[PDB]
């Protein structure tokens, strides 16, 4: 046993490994959604931009639960990182519908992952897990939501005109 | 009697309370339409925006009418804020037309409590009304009819294209 | 269904929407008691200011629930601001009490409204009434007490010098 | 006639005269209420301030009459200042009650000269009257009612004490 560990149960440290890998898994999805804004023939720089800077904050977020496997004394395992499932994103629409689809998939994990810190009595986990994750996932999907609404109301996607607006007045 | 008072009339100070009423309405109104301007499937935030600050300052002509009652001597009576008579505003030209039809009325309540000050010669009372209110809901009725008449042009509410590049272009 | 809502119960929906009208209650019944303040034959302006910016941290308090509502795609519906119990707020003591006893009132709802989200499984909403609800709460009921303690040690509100000493050297 | 004269009454002429003297007599009041307060056997220096302050403010008032007459092309003519119809006044609650009264009988004089403008339809006038004289009485006459009120509060003339005090903390 290390150390450090205290009231931190083998099956949170395996949902934590669990967390890791799909935050990896999202990050990996934005930055396939983000070069393909930068293909020739989509040519959408700030959705590119937008969606790698998505991709940058899921780095970001698995690094913080590896941080945290570490100072509750667990061990990091790690596992593939699977291709997203497109190459090809359709529409600046298309994609933003399948980023609110992968934001509420994370949002899940992480419920189910509070549920089991709540089932273990682990407040420090769960306090994490609020603090740290569930705030920033309901302010994400309000985004895309939102983001997703403008582009349906503008004429999205039949309407080239509407995603090169949007990306110029919302994105950029 | 209040040691403060002078030349001010009983249905004057009756009516300065039911104006207190009014823009505390006003600003409800305005705080039910700025949030709906922030639903996800609605999504213009210079709308939310917009109206949020009117919603504010119809607060402060509440505030000042409270502190003339008390200048005058008179004295503050309150009734219940009534709800805005619509829950969802349809689009952003649907709102900015109640917000239209509700300036007017203010206006209209405004000239009368004018008119009975003038009836019973109260010139601070005129005055206050003239310097602080009328002006101003001169300048509010123009600014909401220029903005009704550049979402018709533009293809308002059908054309949510329209909404979008307004909400970008004027509101924001 | 709201394309962003998730883990969200109908019954955490209608409970956002009640105790957003009791945050705006809350914002009529200090903003009633500070013009109270305003009085000539009351004349103590510290209490005024006190009681004005109280009010308008409530009206800020009602802003951010109608944005949790929104954020978790639920739908805000709003009632009439019922005026406040009093329009004479009697002494400088008698109106701190009355709002201790509103802050007591309103943190009750708060816990009630933590109870519902917890037997809902809604760590989202636990997290934000915690975060920005509970502590401001207490903090607001400890300085309450601290203040009708200080007025009934000064001798309030048979000592008009107690009231007026205490807006000086406390409220101002 | 003068050059300059137009839409000006000989009523309003004269009135404007018969205002000079009433601004001057208020301004000797006030100075006479000031040194009271500067005796040695009296000694409240913030009540000497503050009235000395409210006597350069009706000369100012005065000043202001007399450029009016000029402007529309009446002729100034004066008259002699009577006296205070006090020498000693007794204590700083029973100077602020003589101050109210002196700012009421100043008021309804302006009222009076407003109601004549309006009878000869002398729109400059009105608003002259209206914009550098009205709000100013108004303001006035509440800020010495709230004194007056405090210092009753507080057990004034009797209590030495609450004059002091209220003499540091209100007017110093
Ligand atoms: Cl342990
Ligand atoms: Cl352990
Ligand atoms: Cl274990
Ligand atoms: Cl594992
Ligand atoms: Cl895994
Ligand atoms: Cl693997
Ligand atoms: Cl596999
Ligand atoms: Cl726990
Ligand atoms: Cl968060
Ligand atoms: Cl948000
Ligand atoms: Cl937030
Ligand atoms: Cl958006
Ligand atoms: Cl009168
Ligand atoms: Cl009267
Ligand atoms: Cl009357
Ligand atoms: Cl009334
Ligand atoms: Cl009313
Ligand atoms: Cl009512
Ligand atoms: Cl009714
Ligand atoms: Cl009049
Ligand atoms: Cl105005
Ligand atoms: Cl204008
Ligand atoms: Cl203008
Ligand atoms: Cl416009
Ligand atoms: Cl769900
Ligand atoms: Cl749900
Ligand atoms: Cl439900
Ligand atoms: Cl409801
Ligand atoms: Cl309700
Ligand atoms: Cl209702
Ligand atoms: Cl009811
Ligand atoms: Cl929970
Ligand atoms: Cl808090
Ligand atoms: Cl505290
Ligand atoms: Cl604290
Ligand atoms: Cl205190
Ligand atoms: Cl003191
Ligand atoms: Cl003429
Ligand atoms: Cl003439
Ligand atoms: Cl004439
Ligand atoms: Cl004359
Ligand atoms: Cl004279
Ligand atoms: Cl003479
Ligand atoms: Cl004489
Ligand atoms: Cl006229
Ligand atoms: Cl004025
Ligand atoms: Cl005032
Ligand atoms: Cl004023
Ligand atoms: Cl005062
Ligand atoms: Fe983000
Ligand atoms: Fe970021
Ligand atoms: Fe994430
Ligand atoms: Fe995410
Ligand atoms: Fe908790
Ligand atoms: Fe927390
Ligand atoms: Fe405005
Ligand atoms: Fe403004
Ligand atoms: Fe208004
Ligand atoms: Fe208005
Ligand atoms: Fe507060
Ligand atoms: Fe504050
Ligand atoms: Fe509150
Ligand atoms: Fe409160
Ligand atoms: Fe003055
Ligand atoms: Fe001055
Ligand atoms: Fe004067
Ligand atoms: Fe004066
Ligand atoms: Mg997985
Ligand atoms: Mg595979
Ligand atoms: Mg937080
Ligand atoms: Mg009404
Ligand atoms: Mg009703
Ligand atoms: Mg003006
Ligand atoms: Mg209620
Ligand atoms: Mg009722
Ligand atoms: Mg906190
Ligand atoms: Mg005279
Ligand atoms: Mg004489
Ligand atoms: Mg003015």
């Given at each position: ?14 949902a934590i490994?669990?967390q890791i890998?799909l935050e990896?898994?999202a ?30 904050e899921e780095?970001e977020h698995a690094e913080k639960l590896?941080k945290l ?34 934001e509420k998939?994370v949002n899940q994990s992480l419920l189910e992952l509070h549920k089991?810190a ?7 986990l769960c306090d994490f897990i609020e603090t740290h994750y569930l705030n920033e996932q309901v302010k994400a999907i ?31």
């Open positions: 046993t290390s150390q450090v560990r205290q009231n931190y149960h083998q099956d949170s440290e395996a490994n669990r890998n990896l898994y990050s990996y999805v934005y930055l396939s959604m983000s070069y393909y804004f930068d293909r020739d023939d989509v040519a959408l720089k700030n959705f590119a931009k937008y969606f790698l800077h998505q991709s940058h780095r590896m496997q570490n100072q509750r004394g667990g061990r990091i395992f790690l596992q593939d990182i699977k291709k997203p499932d497109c190459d090809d994103w359709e529409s600046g629409l298309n994609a933003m519908e399948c980023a609110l689809h992968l998939n089991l709540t089932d273990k009595n682990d407040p420090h309000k985004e895309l939501g939102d983001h997703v609404t403008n582009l349906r109301k503008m004429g999205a996607p039949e309407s080239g005109l509407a995603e090169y607006l949007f990306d110029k007045h919302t994105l950029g």
